[PDB]
C-alpha cells in the first residue's frame, strides 16, 4: 500500500499512453487493472529499453507505430498457436530498437480470461525477447526447467508448454540449442509467464507443470529485481549516475586522505617484489658460493616462479646445510603483499610464520588500513547497492579449478564441476581486503567466477578514483544463488551473495564443529566432550571446508578397519591431537608451528602429519601431487599416524617410526619405486602412499599394491594386526 | 626433528 504503487503510477505515467474516444475514465481504468497483474519491475524494464504501451481504440494496426509493418508481421499466433490476423486481434508487441506494445480495449479482461492471458502472453514475449535478451537470458538456469519437463514422468507438462519443434527434439536442450532456436525457448518462457500472471490459468500451470510454475514464482517474486539490476548495469548513464553518488558520499573521506593514506591503499593494490640487490647484500661468502655451486632447480619445495628469481641471483653475480639455506631464501624472496598475508593467516597476523620484523611491518599497515576504512557505505542517496568482483576459481578450489573449463571449448564451462562446486556453497568469509567494482567489468582469462555482492549499510569501505571500492576485512557473506551465465560469448559462474555480520557466519561454523564431534566421539567411543575435530575456517570457500570434513571422515571410515581407527585415533587423542580442516595455510596452524624449531622449517601442502602434536592438518583450497580429492589426502596422512603408533609400540621408551626399521628400509630398497613417484620419496612417504592405495575406494588401486608391492602389502598388513591385537 | 608433508602442484 506504499511506494510500490507510486512507481507503478510514475512508470505508467511515462510508458502508458491512453488514446481513446469513449470517456477515457473507464478505458484508462481498464489498463490499470490489467497491467497491475504484471510484476512492477518488468514494466520499468520496458521503460529501460525505451518501450511504450498504447491503449488504442479500433483496429490496432491503425495506430502510428504499427502502420510500418510488412505483410508477415500482420499474421500472428495466439498463446495457443492458432494463426490470426493482427487487424483482428487485440494485442501486439512490435520488436526493434524502438519497442512498443499495442493493446486494444475492453473492461472484460476481467471476464475474457482467455484474452487477458494473451495480453500477458505478449508481455511475456517482451520480457524474454526484448528485455532479457539484452543480458543473455534465459540461460542454463531456464534450460534446466525446460529439460525437467520433457524428460519427466507425466507427459502433460510438455503438452501444455512445449511445441512439436521442442516436443520431438531427440536429446535434452543444450546451450547450443537455445542459441539457434531462441525464438522457440523465448516462446516457452512467455507462455509460462502468461499462465502464471493470469490468476486463473495459474493453477493449470501449477498442476501440469510445477517445475515451470515454481521457476516463474521465484523469478517474479525476487530474482526479477536482479534482472533489472543487470539491465541497468549496461546503461552508460545508470553506471555513471551510480558511481557519482558513491563518489559524492565518500567525498569528504577522500579529500581528507593524506599522502600516507594514498600510500597505504596503493601498495595494498600492488605488492613490492624483493629487490635482488638487497637479497645478495644480506648473504655471506659461504652462502653466496653455495649459490653458484647450488643446482637451484635440483630442489623440490621451490616453485618454478620462485626458482626463477633464485636463478637470476646467480647470473647477476643438494645436502643438509645447503637445503637449509634454500628454506630461508624462500621466506625472503616473497612479495610484500598485504592482502596475501591476511588470506594466508586468515586474519591471524601474529602467526609466527615469517620473520619478526616483516610481521610487525604487516601488522602496522593493517591496523592502519583498518582505521582508513572507517566510513560505511550507508547513505541517503540510495538503498540496495550491488558491488562486483571477478575471481579465479583456483582461489577457492584448485582441485575443481583444475577441470572447470571445457578442455576443448575454452568458452564453455564443464557442467560436471559446476554442480560439484555449487554443491555446498552456503557461506563465505573474507579475511583480507576485498577490492570490488561499482559497476560490473570484464574479467581476466583465468577468472571465470563473477560475484554480485549486496552490501550492508553497515559495511565500511574506501572509495578509489578508478571506480572501485576497498572493503573492510572480516566480512561475512551468504551465498544466495549460483548459476551459469553467458557474457561476451564466454560462460561464467554468477555468484549472487549478501553481506552479513561475520559473527553470524562464525557461529554457524562453531555449532557445526560442536555437532561433528558430538557425532564422531560417539562412533569411536571417545568421551562425549573431546576436542578431536577442529575447523580453522577464514576464507571465501568456507561452508565447503566444513561440509567436506564430514564427507572426508565418512570415506575414512568406510575404507579402513574400525578397530584400526579407534586404536590409532586414541593414541592421537592421548597426545592432544587434532583433525584440522582449514583454509588458511598450514605454516599458520599452531599444531605445526608451536613445535617448529625454526620458522624456515615450516611446511605447507594438501595435508601434513605432525608427530609432536599428533594431529593431521588438511588444507582445503589446494590440490596435492595428483590426488583427485581431499579424501585421499586425509587417508594418506592417516598412514603417517599409523606409522607413528606402529613404531611406538616397539620400544615405548622412545617412540620412533616403524617405517625406520632395518627391515622396512629394505622393502623400500626394491619396492619403493613400484607405486607412485611421490611415494618414491622415502620410507614414511612410501608407507603412507602404499597404505593409502591399499585402502583406496577404487579396488583397482588396491590390486596395484598387491601385484607390485608384495612385501609391502604384507608389511602394512602385519602392522595393522599388530596394532589391532595390541 | 620432522613432519610428513604432502605438497600440492603450483604451476
Ligand atoms: Zn606424506
XYZ file of C-alpha atoms and ligand atoms in Angstrom:
738
model
C 0.000 0.000 0.000
C 3.120 2.183 -0.260
C 5.832 3.214 -2.755
C 5.100 0.048 -4.730
C 2.100 1.795 -6.333
C 3.880 5.151 -6.595
C 6.368 3.964 -9.233
C 3.588 1.884 -10.770
C 1.884 5.198 -11.452
C 5.078 7.060 -12.433
C 6.302 4.235 -14.644
C 2.814 4.021 -16.110
C 2.664 7.811 -16.322
C 5.578 7.589 -18.757
C 5.213 4.459 -20.909
C 1.437 4.076 -20.721
C -0.247 6.235 -23.368
C -4.062 6.157 -23.429
C -5.675 7.476 -26.625
C -9.392 6.652 -26.840
C -12.717 8.240 -27.785
C -15.187 6.995 -25.157
C -14.700 8.784 -21.852
C -11.155 7.649 -21.049
C -12.335 7.232 -17.457
C -13.097 3.516 -17.715
C -10.587 2.869 -20.525
C -7.701 4.409 -18.576
C -9.052 2.356 -15.654
C -9.002 -0.876 -17.665
C -5.302 -0.875 -18.494
C -4.596 -0.001 -14.855
C -6.333 -3.079 -13.514
C -4.813 -5.097 -16.359
C -1.109 -4.241 -16.005
C -1.233 -4.344 -12.198
C -1.044 -8.109 -12.589
C 2.395 -7.806 -14.164
C 5.402 -7.643 -11.828
C 6.257 -3.941 -11.400
C 9.894 -4.446 -12.408
C 9.099 -5.738 -15.902
C 7.214 -2.505 -16.530
C 10.240 -0.414 -15.617
C 12.496 -2.660 -17.695
C 10.428 -1.932 -20.802
C 10.907 1.703 -19.942
C 14.603 0.942 -19.601
C 14.850 -0.272 -23.236
C 12.633 2.584 -24.374
C 9.318 0.811 -24.571
C 5.872 2.361 -24.780
C 2.434 0.815 -24.068
C -0.518 2.074 -26.139
C -4.191 1.659 -25.208
C -5.951 2.333 -28.536
C -9.483 2.131 -29.959
C -10.327 0.395 -33.224
C -8.116 -1.733 -35.458
C -4.810 -1.653 -33.527
C -2.925 -1.965 -36.855
C -4.377 1.508 -37.387
C -2.017 3.203 -34.911
C 1.050 5.267 -35.771
C 3.905 2.928 -34.714
C 2.419 -0.154 -36.365
C 1.407 1.049 -39.835
C 5.050 0.364 -40.721
C 4.863 -3.457 -40.631
C 5.382 -5.678 -43.671
C 2.889 -8.298 -44.866
C 4.030 -11.064 -42.496
C 4.263 -9.043 -39.268
C 0.452 -8.928 -39.627
C -0.300 -12.653 -39.089
C 0.418 -13.857 -35.538
C -0.254 -16.907 -33.370
C -2.120 -16.723 -30.066
C -0.929 -18.232 -26.803
C -2.436 -21.422 -28.230
C -0.641 -21.400 -31.590
C -3.728 -20.684 -33.651
C -2.976 -18.326 -36.532
C -4.675 -14.936 -36.618
C -4.878 -11.593 -38.394
C -3.407 -8.670 -36.488
C -6.112 -6.232 -37.562
C -8.491 -8.698 -35.869
C -6.601 -9.481 -32.650
C -6.419 -7.217 -29.588
C -2.711 -7.179 -28.762
C 0.732 -6.952 -30.362
C 4.279 -6.164 -29.281
C 6.473 -4.708 -32.007
C 10.122 -5.645 -31.783
C 13.010 -3.474 -32.897
C 15.342 -0.953 -31.276
C 12.212 1.098 -30.605
C 9.807 -1.397 -28.946
C 6.099 -0.706 -28.438
C 3.106 -2.584 -27.031
C -0.359 -2.020 -28.534
C -3.409 -3.180 -26.538
C -6.972 -2.675 -27.792
C -9.637 -2.021 -25.145
C -12.410 -3.656 -23.117
C -13.477 -3.940 -19.461
C -13.805 -7.716 -19.895
C -10.150 -8.585 -19.368
C -11.862 -9.382 -16.098
C -14.171 -11.879 -17.792
C -12.337 -12.944 -21.004
C -9.584 -14.655 -19.032
C -8.514 -16.050 -22.427
C -7.757 -12.590 -23.813
C -6.118 -11.306 -20.605
C -3.915 -14.366 -20.958
C -2.919 -13.410 -24.495
C -2.017 -9.879 -23.450
C 0.129 -11.344 -20.649
C 1.460 -13.836 -23.129
C 2.637 -10.989 -25.313
C 4.079 -9.061 -22.414
C 5.885 -12.273 -21.607
C 7.236 -12.161 -25.136
C 8.551 -8.656 -24.420
C 10.248 -9.923 -21.283
C 12.162 -12.798 -22.924
C 12.799 -11.364 -26.394
C 13.197 -7.619 -25.723
C 14.316 -7.291 -22.091
C 16.241 -10.442 -21.043
C 17.780 -10.918 -24.484
C 19.897 -7.880 -23.676
C 21.500 -9.529 -20.633
C 21.821 -13.010 -22.227
C 18.802 -14.792 -20.708
C 17.043 -17.095 -20.282
C 20.098 -19.301 -20.000
C 21.182 -22.571 -18.391
C 19.023 -21.972 -15.352
C 15.891 -21.901 -17.520
C 17.194 -24.660 -19.839
C 17.156 -26.819 -16.732
C 13.483 -26.144 -16.017
C 12.717 -26.891 -19.669
C 14.555 -30.224 -19.601
C 12.999 -31.231 -16.265
C 9.671 -31.114 -18.104
C 10.410 -33.047 -21.295
C 12.291 -35.882 -19.623
C 9.799 -36.382 -16.790
C 7.047 -38.739 -15.601
C 3.814 -37.149 -16.833
C 3.862 -36.026 -20.471
C 1.217 -33.368 -19.760
C 3.610 -30.585 -18.774
C 5.129 -30.825 -22.241
C 1.664 -30.822 -23.807
C 0.826 -27.530 -22.043
C 4.000 -25.533 -22.818
C 6.194 -27.226 -25.463
C 5.539 -27.337 -29.195
C 6.348 -30.218 -31.515
C 9.576 -28.492 -32.501
C 10.591 -28.922 -28.871
C 8.437 -31.988 -28.199
C 10.114 -34.034 -30.948
C 13.653 -32.969 -30.036
C 15.831 -36.083 -29.610
C 18.168 -35.258 -26.708
C 17.998 -32.640 -23.953
C 18.172 -28.898 -24.619
C 21.846 -27.884 -24.571
C 23.133 -24.315 -24.574
C 23.830 -24.738 -28.295
C 20.163 -25.497 -28.907
C 18.784 -22.478 -27.045
C 21.184 -20.481 -29.176
C 19.886 -21.426 -32.618
C 16.244 -21.739 -31.551
C 15.947 -18.647 -29.358
C 12.529 -17.868 -30.789
C 11.440 -21.284 -29.507
C 12.794 -21.048 -25.969
C 11.606 -17.423 -25.757
C 8.106 -18.576 -26.587
C 8.050 -21.155 -23.800
C 9.191 -18.548 -21.308
C 6.332 -16.331 -22.464
C 3.615 -18.996 -22.079
C 4.880 -19.855 -18.610
C 4.915 -16.175 -17.657
C 1.365 -15.844 -19.043
C -0.277 -18.770 -17.264
C 1.476 -17.572 -14.110
C 0.436 -13.926 -14.359
C -3.216 -14.540 -15.208
C -4.568 -15.643 -11.776
C -6.987 -18.130 -13.357
C -4.671 -20.246 -15.512
C -2.106 -20.269 -12.718
C -3.490 -23.488 -11.281
C -3.294 -25.246 -14.646
C 0.393 -24.265 -14.702
C 0.995 -25.426 -11.125
C -0.949 -28.629 -11.750
C 0.528 -29.834 -15.038
C 3.903 -28.080 -14.914
C 5.166 -27.292 -11.383
C 8.834 -27.051 -12.320
C 7.817 -24.225 -14.625
C 5.384 -22.666 -12.129
C 7.997 -22.744 -9.377
C 10.542 -21.116 -11.628
C 8.183 -18.277 -12.642
C 7.123 -17.878 -8.998
C 10.613 -17.408 -7.604
C 11.505 -15.235 -10.588
C 8.637 -12.718 -10.354
C 8.960 -12.612 -6.565
C 12.621 -11.718 -6.261
C 15.081 -12.909 -8.902
C 13.495 -10.346 -11.241
C 14.954 -7.448 -9.278
C 18.399 -8.829 -10.026
C 17.395 -8.887 -13.683
C 16.597 -5.186 -13.657
C 19.878 -4.527 -11.814
C 21.699 -6.344 -14.620
C 19.864 -4.319 -17.280
C 20.768 -1.050 -15.560
C 24.406 -2.178 -15.408
C 24.609 -1.969 -19.188
C 23.462 1.646 -19.475
C 26.195 4.281 -19.528
C 24.119 6.825 -17.661
C 22.959 4.378 -14.969
C 26.531 3.281 -14.414
C 27.768 6.855 -14.138
C 24.919 8.047 -12.002
C 25.610 5.236 -9.507
C 29.347 5.883 -9.482
C 28.711 9.586 -8.806
C 26.520 9.266 -5.724
C 29.081 6.862 -4.274
C 31.886 9.316 -5.116
C 29.829 12.042 -3.533
C 29.094 10.041 -0.374
C 32.800 9.439 0.156
C 33.805 12.972 -0.960
C 34.778 14.255 2.473
C 36.561 10.952 3.245
C 38.717 11.196 0.132
C 39.574 14.920 0.329
C 40.805 14.203 3.854
C 43.040 11.298 2.822
C 46.708 12.066 3.442
C 49.673 11.068 1.331
C 50.363 8.078 3.626
C 46.706 7.284 3.226
C 47.052 7.052 -0.537
C 50.390 5.390 0.049
C 48.931 2.506 2.035
C 45.968 1.967 -0.247
C 48.376 1.970 -3.138
C 50.728 -0.774 -2.035
C 47.668 -2.684 -0.868
C 46.928 -2.899 -4.594
C 50.372 -3.738 -5.879
C 52.917 -5.802 -3.862
C 56.595 -4.875 -3.559
C 58.756 -7.581 -5.169
C 62.059 -8.261 -3.385
C 64.972 -6.436 -4.924
C 67.834 -8.691 -5.953
C 70.250 -6.060 -4.674
C 69.185 -6.450 -1.040
C 68.995 -10.229 -1.253
C 72.653 -10.547 -2.316
C 73.681 -7.896 0.245
C 72.395 -9.977 3.172
C 74.146 -13.175 2.053
C 77.607 -14.463 3.034
C 80.582 -15.711 1.005
C 79.654 -19.047 2.470
C 76.057 -18.719 1.279
C 76.957 -16.945 -1.981
C 79.417 -19.604 -3.232
C 76.902 -22.274 -2.368
C 74.581 -20.139 -4.504
C 76.644 -20.854 -7.613
C 77.526 -24.481 -6.951
C 73.882 -24.940 -5.964
C 71.633 -26.514 -8.597
C 68.692 -24.314 -7.557
C 66.491 -26.318 -9.921
C 67.523 -29.529 -8.142
C 65.342 -28.563 -5.149
C 61.706 -29.631 -4.859
C 59.989 -27.295 -2.374
C 60.519 -24.179 -4.506
C 58.020 -23.112 -7.159
C 59.273 -22.542 -10.721
C 58.402 -18.861 -10.343
C 60.383 -18.672 -7.083
C 63.072 -20.914 -8.536
C 63.240 -18.462 -11.423
C 64.152 -15.410 -9.301
C 66.552 -17.693 -7.441
C 68.382 -18.412 -10.700
C 68.606 -14.772 -11.722
C 70.538 -14.215 -8.494
C 73.339 -16.409 -9.860
C 73.602 -14.594 -13.211
C 73.534 -11.153 -11.577
C 76.568 -12.245 -9.516
C 71.989 -30.625 -2.538
C 72.613 -31.574 1.083
C 71.662 -30.605 4.611
C 73.206 -27.158 5.213
C 72.645 -26.481 1.501
C 68.873 -27.040 1.550
C 68.538 -25.339 4.943
C 69.781 -22.305 3.061
C 67.115 -22.523 0.340
C 64.441 -22.716 3.051
C 65.315 -19.204 4.189
C 65.605 -17.623 0.735
C 62.094 -18.936 0.170
C 60.781 -16.787 3.056
C 62.874 -13.880 1.819
C 62.063 -13.897 -1.914
C 58.338 -13.448 -1.200
C 56.473 -10.322 -2.421
C 55.332 -7.909 0.247
C 51.631 -8.496 -0.362
C 49.360 -7.285 2.439
C 46.190 -8.965 1.146
C 48.074 -12.243 0.721
C 49.220 -12.173 4.323
C 45.662 -11.712 5.572
C 44.435 -14.632 3.463
C 47.336 -16.935 4.366
C 46.737 -16.397 8.086
C 43.032 -15.924 7.734
C 43.403 -12.792 9.794
C 45.735 -14.202 12.415
C 48.516 -11.700 11.837
C 50.515 -12.624 14.930
C 51.216 -16.046 13.403
C 54.994 -16.609 13.704
C 55.180 -17.952 10.171
C 57.505 -15.200 8.975
C 60.459 -13.151 10.280
C 59.586 -10.978 13.287
C 60.460 -7.702 11.549
C 58.243 -8.234 8.459
C 55.427 -9.495 10.665
C 55.453 -6.217 12.620
C 55.626 -4.332 9.341
C 52.486 -6.169 8.165
C 50.599 -5.527 11.436
C 51.148 -1.735 11.296
C 49.986 -1.360 7.709
C 46.952 -3.471 8.518
C 45.994 -1.746 11.762
C 46.365 1.450 9.757
C 44.264 0.478 6.724
C 41.758 -0.745 9.306
C 41.433 2.864 10.503
C 41.377 4.365 6.974
C 38.432 2.205 6.023
C 36.209 3.614 8.738
C 33.210 5.051 6.793
C 30.287 2.777 5.903
C 28.529 2.765 2.535
C 25.210 3.615 4.206
C 23.832 6.779 2.596
C 20.667 8.813 1.919
C 21.449 8.739 -1.829
C 20.495 5.060 -2.313
C 19.251 1.745 -0.806
C 20.375 -1.654 -2.096
C 23.792 -1.329 -3.720
C 25.403 -4.167 -5.624
C 29.166 -4.271 -5.997
C 31.081 -6.629 -8.279
C 34.196 -8.777 -8.111
C 35.941 -11.090 -10.567
C 37.542 -14.183 -9.044
C 39.739 -17.077 -10.127
C 38.225 -20.408 -9.045
C 41.651 -21.806 -8.105
C 41.338 -19.375 -5.209
C 38.510 -21.460 -3.755
C 39.294 -24.966 -5.011
C 42.333 -25.708 -7.118
C 41.221 -29.315 -7.407
C 37.954 -28.306 -9.091
C 39.513 -25.303 -10.771
C 41.633 -27.904 -12.490
C 38.700 -29.213 -14.538
C 36.222 -26.297 -14.514
C 36.791 -25.254 -18.128
C 35.839 -27.476 -21.044
C 39.189 -28.833 -22.304
C 38.124 -28.175 -25.896
C 35.883 -25.065 -25.932
C 37.547 -22.530 -23.648
C 34.306 -20.526 -23.677
C 32.241 -23.296 -22.127
C 32.169 -24.426 -18.503
C 32.003 -28.102 -17.593
C 28.564 -28.716 -16.048
C 30.036 -31.603 -14.075
C 32.358 -29.492 -11.987
C 29.713 -26.793 -11.787
C 27.255 -28.781 -9.669
C 30.158 -30.098 -7.648
C 31.413 -26.557 -6.949
C 27.854 -25.420 -6.446
C 27.327 -28.275 -4.024
C 27.938 -26.998 -0.508
C 28.407 -23.322 -1.063
C 26.224 -21.720 1.546
C 28.530 -19.140 3.032
C 31.765 -17.263 2.632
C 34.240 -15.259 4.720
C 36.710 -12.526 3.736
C 39.786 -12.037 5.894
C 41.789 -9.697 3.673
C 40.587 -6.568 1.845
C 38.045 -7.226 -0.903
C 38.546 -4.884 -3.874
C 35.292 -4.534 -5.830
C 33.792 -2.585 -8.767
C 30.962 -0.103 -8.602
C 29.680 -1.432 -11.931
C 30.492 -4.875 -13.330
C 33.576 -5.132 -15.559
C 35.051 -7.818 -17.888
C 37.349 -10.305 -16.195
C 40.809 -11.783 -16.787
C 41.194 -15.029 -18.705
C 41.772 -17.072 -15.567
C 38.731 -15.557 -13.849
C 35.505 -17.439 -14.521
C 33.761 -16.508 -11.287
C 31.735 -13.286 -11.315
C 30.432 -12.226 -7.921
C 27.444 -9.903 -7.394
C 27.522 -8.773 -3.747
C 24.700 -6.986 -1.893
C 26.484 -4.752 0.660
C 25.160 -3.769 4.038
C 24.601 -0.144 5.081
C 26.946 -1.118 7.918
C 29.806 -2.147 5.604
C 32.842 0.134 5.808
C 34.745 0.881 2.618
C 37.189 3.224 0.907
C 36.482 4.889 -2.453
C 39.033 4.611 -5.280
C 39.217 7.007 -8.220
C 39.157 4.225 -10.826
C 35.644 3.298 -9.753
C 36.366 0.596 -7.244
C 35.783 0.208 -3.501
C 38.208 -1.291 -0.981
C 36.181 -3.135 1.673
C 36.907 -3.746 5.356
C 38.429 -7.079 6.390
C 36.470 -9.773 8.235
C 33.318 -9.664 6.138
C 30.600 -12.282 6.401
C 28.937 -13.463 3.179
C 25.868 -15.657 2.491
C 25.536 -17.249 -0.919
C 22.071 -16.624 -2.365
C 22.396 -18.070 -5.855
C 24.894 -19.719 -8.215
C 24.178 -20.184 -11.898
C 25.951 -20.482 -15.260
C 25.652 -17.303 -17.338
C 26.931 -16.108 -20.720
C 28.781 -12.828 -21.111
C 30.801 -11.698 -24.121
C 30.374 -15.056 -25.826
C 32.021 -16.831 -22.925
C 30.483 -18.649 -19.931
C 30.857 -17.623 -16.280
C 29.527 -18.568 -12.851
C 27.439 -15.727 -11.377
C 27.556 -15.861 -7.607
C 24.843 -13.747 -6.019
C 25.766 -13.126 -2.344
C 24.724 -10.869 0.547
C 26.909 -9.292 3.238
C 26.074 -10.184 6.843
C 27.775 -9.884 10.267
C 30.860 -12.118 10.235
C 29.861 -13.288 13.723
C 26.772 -14.924 12.199
C 28.843 -16.995 9.789
C 31.395 -17.834 12.518
C 28.658 -19.091 14.852
C 27.460 -21.473 12.127
C 30.984 -22.835 11.879
C 31.198 -23.040 15.677
C 27.982 -25.079 16.064
C 28.978 -27.203 13.068
C 32.150 -28.118 14.950
C 30.199 -28.994 18.109
C 27.929 -31.217 16.063
C 30.719 -33.028 14.192
C 32.364 -34.027 17.490
C 29.148 -34.989 19.294
C 28.812 -37.442 16.421
C 32.269 -38.940 15.842
C 33.125 -39.009 19.535
C 30.260 -41.469 19.703
C 31.108 -43.517 16.623
C 34.618 -44.000 18.077
C 33.898 -44.432 21.767
C 35.607 -41.249 22.878
C 34.490 -39.208 25.889
C 31.431 -37.153 24.841
C 33.350 -33.879 25.212
C 36.655 -34.292 23.390
C 38.249 -31.772 21.040
C 39.136 -34.082 18.161
C 37.960 -32.349 15.004
C 38.692 -28.681 14.513
C 37.576 -26.216 11.804
C 40.045 -23.370 11.238
C 37.984 -21.566 8.568
C 38.590 -17.975 7.491
C 38.406 -17.707 3.728
C 35.963 -17.340 0.755
C 35.037 -21.050 0.249
C 34.172 -21.539 3.946
C 30.986 -23.641 4.077
C 32.636 -26.132 1.702
C 35.617 -26.597 4.059
C 33.052 -27.523 6.759
C 30.691 -29.782 4.768
C 33.739 -31.553 3.298
C 35.087 -32.651 6.694
C 32.009 -34.829 7.122
C 32.479 -36.493 3.702
C 36.199 -36.996 4.180
C 35.769 -38.745 7.511
C 32.922 -40.930 6.136
C 35.252 -42.318 3.462
C 37.985 -42.820 6.141
C 35.502 -44.804 7.977
C 34.269 -46.880 5.020
C 37.758 -47.861 3.818
C 39.638 -48.618 6.996
C 39.223 -51.189 9.762
C 37.126 -49.623 12.521
C 39.348 -51.338 15.083
C 42.455 -49.852 13.436
C 40.892 -46.383 13.658
C 39.814 -46.468 17.297
C 43.223 -47.833 18.339
C 45.115 -45.140 16.466
C 42.858 -42.139 16.989
C 43.004 -42.977 20.713
C 46.762 -42.718 20.700
C 46.315 -39.372 18.976
C 43.683 -38.042 21.376
C 46.069 -39.034 24.163
C 48.741 -36.594 22.996
C 46.031 -33.981 22.389
C 45.956 -34.480 18.639
C 43.513 -32.817 16.294
C 41.951 -33.400 12.914
C 42.297 -29.933 11.436
C 40.294 -28.951 8.357
C 41.313 -25.439 7.294
C 41.568 -22.884 4.517
C 44.491 -20.892 5.981
C 47.956 -22.181 5.029
C 49.476 -24.920 7.119
C 52.510 -22.956 8.342
C 49.879 -20.944 10.315
C 48.226 -23.711 12.365
C 49.535 -23.934 15.930
C 49.544 -27.750 15.662
C 52.570 -27.309 13.388
C 54.199 -24.043 14.268
C 54.136 -24.336 18.085
C 56.570 -27.207 17.633
C 58.957 -25.976 14.949
C 62.493 -25.015 15.948
C 62.957 -22.531 13.141
C 60.250 -20.769 11.164
C 62.065 -21.813 7.997
C 61.342 -25.429 8.992
C 57.692 -24.905 8.056
C 55.656 -26.960 5.594
C 52.626 -26.143 3.512
C 50.762 -28.726 1.480
C 47.475 -30.508 0.846
C 47.829 -32.468 4.056
C 50.532 -32.922 6.657
C 51.047 -35.069 9.752
C 52.655 -33.609 12.863
C 54.180 -36.119 15.307
C 54.815 -33.685 18.159
C 51.144 -32.701 18.217
C 49.835 -35.973 16.856
C 47.492 -34.092 14.576
C 46.548 -34.285 10.939
C 46.252 -30.958 9.139
C 44.352 -30.809 5.848
C 44.407 -27.638 3.750
C 41.191 -27.354 1.783
C 41.857 -24.871 -1.092
C 44.860 -26.639 -2.699
C 45.413 -29.764 -4.759
C 48.044 -32.288 -3.670
C 50.521 -34.015 -6.030
C 47.777 -35.508 -8.174
C 45.261 -36.911 -5.732
C 41.774 -36.400 -7.143
C 40.399 -35.399 -3.739
C 40.557 -34.282 -0.135
C 39.643 -37.794 0.982
C 42.755 -39.484 -0.339
C 44.849 -36.751 1.236
C 43.454 -37.307 4.713
C 43.880 -41.067 4.386
C 47.480 -40.807 3.198
C 48.152 -38.677 6.254
C 46.462 -41.241 8.436
C 49.113 -43.622 7.142
C 51.697 -41.441 8.876
C 49.606 -41.665 12.026
C 49.683 -45.470 11.780
C 53.423 -45.485 11.077
C 53.583 -43.433 14.284
C 51.594 -45.781 16.546
C 53.250 -48.809 14.988
C 56.857 -47.942 15.676
C 55.641 -46.592 19.038
C 54.523 -49.995 20.249
C 58.066 -51.273 19.595
C 60.142 -49.701 22.395
C 57.899 -47.120 24.127
C 60.988 -45.701 25.885
C 61.362 -43.795 22.599
C 58.522 -43.507 20.066
C 60.108 -43.968 16.637
C 58.595 -44.689 13.216
C 58.166 -48.344 12.286
C 58.998 -47.135 8.800
C 62.517 -46.593 10.133
C 63.110 -50.296 10.866
C 66.056 -52.112 9.322
C 63.607 -54.492 7.696
C 61.363 -51.911 6.047
C 64.185 -49.721 4.748
C 64.931 -52.815 2.682
C 61.370 -53.242 1.394
C 61.869 -49.702 0.157
C 65.239 -50.733 -1.243
C 63.440 -52.586 -4.041
C 59.705 -51.882 -3.976
C 59.858 -48.154 -3.238
C 59.743 -47.442 -6.972
C 56.683 -49.538 -7.797
C 53.819 -47.307 -6.691
C 53.687 -43.528 -7.056
C 56.628 -41.309 -7.846
C 55.731 -39.374 -4.746
C 55.889 -42.493 -2.599
C 59.349 -42.955 -4.083
C 60.469 -40.050 -1.901
C 61.345 -42.068 1.179
C 60.182 -44.650 3.701
C 57.428 -42.795 5.567
C 56.152 -41.354 2.305
C 56.256 -44.745 0.643
C 54.445 -46.284 3.617
C 51.628 -43.711 3.632
C 51.337 -43.752 -0.163
C 51.159 -47.533 -0.161
C 48.876 -47.558 2.858
C 46.619 -45.084 1.043
C 46.278 -47.019 -2.212
C 45.568 -50.186 -0.258
C 42.566 -48.625 1.459
C 41.518 -46.766 -1.700
C 37.868 -46.598 -2.704
C 38.975 -47.890 -6.082
C 39.926 -51.544 -5.708
C 41.801 -51.194 -8.944
C 44.255 -49.091 -6.915
C 44.324 -51.845 -4.314
C 45.390 -54.704 -6.594
C 48.024 -52.292 -7.843
C 49.770 -52.504 -4.478
C 49.326 -56.256 -4.232
C 50.803 -57.123 -7.630
C 53.569 -54.523 -7.432
C 54.392 -54.069 -3.739
C 54.125 -57.638 -2.352
C 56.487 -57.468 0.618
C 54.816 -54.142 1.386
C 51.174 -55.212 1.164
C 52.352 -57.791 3.666
C 54.294 -55.398 5.866
C 51.441 -52.873 6.076
C 49.015 -55.667 6.902
C 51.178 -57.070 9.686
C 51.281 -53.714 11.424
C 47.511 -53.388 11.211
C 47.025 -56.674 13.048
C 49.952 -55.847 15.337
C 48.152 -52.638 16.322
C 44.637 -54.111 16.452
C 45.697 -57.035 18.671
C 47.970 -54.953 20.888
C 63.024 -33.091 14.034
C 60.431 -33.768 11.383
C 56.934 -33.714 9.951
C 55.356 -35.524 6.931
C 54.431 -33.374 4.033
C 52.039 -33.747 1.031
C 52.835 -30.933 -1.444
C 50.344 -29.569 -3.959
C 51.051 -28.708 -7.619
C 51.784 -24.952 -8.215
C 52.312 -24.013 -11.896
Zn 53.303 -37.837 3.464
